[PDB]
Amino acid sequence: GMETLELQGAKLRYHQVGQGPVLIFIPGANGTGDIFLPLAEQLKDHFTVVAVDRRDYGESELTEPLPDSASNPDSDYRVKRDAQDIAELAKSLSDEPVYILGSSSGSIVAMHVLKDYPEVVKKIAFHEPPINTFLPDSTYWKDKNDDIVHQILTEGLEKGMKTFGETLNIAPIDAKMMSQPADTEEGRIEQYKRTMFWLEFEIRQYTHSNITLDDFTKYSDKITLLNGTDSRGSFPQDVNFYINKETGIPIVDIPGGHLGYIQKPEGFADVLLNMWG
């Protein structure tokens, strides 16, 4: 049960309670205004308290995708868009300048509201901002942030071999080949995103999808099951053994492991050409 302001690119949702001059609270990393509700109850006799879900969070919703460049660490799109969200909200609720308080990364949003839309600001408070750009030791803090983001990436890719080895239940050499970190930072970033997408959206949905043995028997003349010569004892071979046992569909052993088509391409090709050539 939240209020809505439709803006360019998003439906902005906010809580509103109180009477009196408008006071907008801008949240930090939690992104949502509900964290200000106990404070709003303390203030509602004196201010019209407005607590925002910033457009990428909570009950707010984007109506257009973020630009490709938003993932660039030097992108200014989001912080600028967040600031003009607050300015538009302030103008939709008040014909006079308003009170604004932002905390943590939300106090950085507040700084940009004052920089680019001073006309909407009556008074403003910056609660514990973590901005470093104007500090004498800016580089220390900026480098540390860039390193922590990269640290989380490396720690993610380290779980690759459990991710594929324990879900596909394949041989460790195959699991290793599948989870081997890419050669470059950009390649590793893409690799991590692929792995996380596959985990969320592919492995469970596909491996429990609606296929039955009677679906194979109906066209058994078209089907060959393939087991790698190097991946014996693995779960996917056990699947093919079950299909072969119950339907009579043949298994052909083909060189290599779970990735035999890239591990041993000449031998893989020879077997296929004998099957189908």
Report d(CA 14, CA 1) in Å as an integer. Answer: 9
User: Measured from the CB atom, is 89 or 179 closer to a copy of itself?
Assistant: 179
Give the residue from 48, 49, 46, 26 showing the smallest Cα distance to 37: 49
Task: List binders of a copy of itself among 214-233 (CB under 8 A).
Answer: 215-216, 218-219, 222-228, 231
Q: What is the distance between the alpha carbons of residues 177 and 275, in angstroms, rounded to a whole number?
A: 27
Rounded to the nearest 10 degrees, how much is the dihedral formed by the CA atoms of 97, 98, 101, 107? -30
Residue from 75, 94, 217, 229 binding a copy of itself (CB under 8 A):
75
Choose, by CB under 8 A, the member of 4, 19, 144, 185 that binds a copy of itself. 144
84 closest CA partner among 58, 122, 110: 110
Q: Are strands 3-7 and 10-18 parallel, antiparallel or unpaired?
A: antiparallel
List 9, 88, 91, 141, residue binding a copy of itself (CB under 8 A): 141
Q: Is 258 in the site for a copy of itself (CB under 8 A)?
A: yes
94 binds a copy of itself (CB under 8 A): no
From CA 273, how far away is CA 277, in angstroms rounded?
A: 4
Residue 91 or 198 with smaller CB distance to a copy of itself: 198
What's the CA gap between 110 and 118, in Å, rounded?
Answer: 10
Q: Please, which residue, 87 or 254, has the CB nearer to a copy of itself?
A: 254
User: Given candidates 154, 180, 201, 248, which one binds a copy of itself under the rule CB under 8 A?
Assistant: 201
Kindly tell me which residue out of 68, 95, 96, 128 binds a copy of itself, with binding defined by CB under 8 A: 128
Q: 151 phi and psi, to 5 degrees? A: -60, -45
Residues 3-22 touching a copy of itself, rule: CB under 8 A, are none
**DSSP-derived secondary structure letter, 5:** E
* DSSP run (H or E) holding 88: helix 77-93
Write 206-214 long-range contacts (CB < 8 A, 24+): 207/167, 213/243, 213/246, 213/247
Which of 1, 38, 172, 233 binds a copy of itself (CB under 8 A)? It is: 38
Does residue 244 touch a copy of itself according to CB under 8 A?
no
Nearer to a copy of itself, 6 or 79 (CB): 79
Write down the least CB distance from residue 52 to a copy of itself, Å.
Answer: 14
CB of 147 to a copy of itself, least distance (A): 9
